[PDB]
Amino acid sequence: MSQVEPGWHFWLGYGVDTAPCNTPKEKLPIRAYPYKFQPNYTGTPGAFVTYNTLKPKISAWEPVTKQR
Amino acid sequence: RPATWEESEEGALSKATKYFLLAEMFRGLYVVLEQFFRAPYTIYYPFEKGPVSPRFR
Ligand SMILES: CCCCCCCCCCCCCCCCCC(=O)OC[C@H](COP(=O)(O)OCCN)OC(=O)CCCCCCCCCCCCCCCCC
């Protein structure tokens, strides 16, 4: 069920009447980037990895010495 | 007051024919026999999805 395109997925489940080639220019959302469609990669090695979006909250000191 | 056996409109023969010939058992049998001959409800899931409202989450 993961291999169906999003605009078609709402149609197969009886959400919309008009199929996504039948809908006019006004409903197609404006984008500034390409579309690529990853279905689901569960068990596949292309499974998602979560991580920290930001850096550790408290900085540590860069060691700087001084000969007196 | 609940009726005794003697103040009943059914005869003993009429009442016990329904007893030994299982009348309403056969009626309830014939119900599901009627249901053998009708259309099932099953949809085939990855080929056919069920309901969607846009409110769904
Ligand atoms: C006046 C008539 C004729 C006079 C001649 C005397 C008899 C001749 C006819 C004999 C044929 C007898 C057939 C079996 C008799 C069953 C009698 C009966 O109903 O058992 C009663 C018994 C409990 O008795 P009780 O506590 O008094 O409560 C009864 C509610 N009134 O209830 C029980 O304990 C359970 C009842 C079980 C019934 C069977 C349930 C499962 C089997 C269903 C078989 C259906 C077959 C259909 C197949 C179709 C095939 C095309």
Q: Do A14 and B54 touch (CB under 8 A)?
A: no
Q: Do A15 and B54 touch (CB under 8 A)?
A: yes
The residue type found at B15 is K
Q: 3-state SS of chain B: helix, strand, coil percent to 5? A: 40, 0, 60
User: Which of A7, A1, A4, A32 lies closest to A22, judged by CA?
Assistant: A7
Structure-determination approach:
cryo-EM
For residues B11 and B32, what is the distance between their CA atoms, to the nearest angstrom? 30
- For A60, list phi and psi in degrees, rounded to 5: -110, 170
Q: Is A3 part of the contact surface with chain B (CB cutoff 8 Å)?
A: no
Resolution reading in Å? 3.0
- The encoded tokens of residue A24 equal 């006019």
Q: Is B54 part of the contact surface with chain A (CB cutoff 8 Å)?
A: yes
Angle at B23 between CA B8 and CA B14, to 5 degrees: 35
Which A residues, 23 through 42, put their C-beta within 8 Å of a C-beta on chain B?
none
Determine contact, residues A11/A20, Cβ cutoff 8 Å: yes
